Design a protein around this ligand. Structure first.
Ligand SMILES: [Ca+2]
Ligand SMILES: [Ca+2]
Length: 145
């Protein structure tokens, strides 16, 4: 088995919850190809701003379990996160395990995958998902009420 942290935003988090699909663009297809049924996905949403300019801190919002092998499907369900026409066609089916909401920032000091504590964001930049050490998954699972 393998644990992963998946990077998305609030709008697509809603799509994920409704469709039970985790998808990534072509540049990250190689990483997704390693995912197998049974794997756990920690869902993370980046920092955003609401319409009134209020900052929405980065959060862990849930844990899902992978239920299918990777597949390809170009159905338009996600909102292109950078304003393009991206469909995030390479996907796995998933099912919910846990739905919650905890701030991510206070956790960096204790998350092993964050090697560079001073600029933790570098571990998320240009990535859709990355493997989580078992210890990191265990800590997040316990904290996500
Ligand atoms: Ca694009
Ligand atoms: Ca693209």
């Amino acid at each position: 088995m393998t644990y992963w942290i998946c990077i998305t935003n609030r709008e697509n988090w809603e799509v994920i919850k409704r469709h039970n699909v985790w998808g990534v663009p072509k540049k990250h297809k190689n990483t997704l190809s390693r995912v197998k049924p049974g794997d756990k996905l920690v869902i993370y949403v980046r920092q955003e701003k609401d319409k009134e300019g209020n900052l929405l801190e980065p959060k862990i919002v849930g844990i899902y379990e992978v239920t299918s092998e990777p597949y390809v499907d170009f159905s338009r369900i996600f909102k292109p996160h950078r304003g393009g026409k991206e469909t995030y066609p390479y996907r796995v089916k998933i099912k919910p395990i846990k739905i919650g909401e905890i701030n991510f920032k206070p956790l960096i000091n204790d998350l092993k995958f964050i090697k560079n504590k001073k600029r933790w964001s570098m571990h998320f930049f240009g990535k859709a998902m990355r493997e989580l050490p078992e210890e990191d998954y265990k800590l997040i699972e316990k904290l996500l009420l």
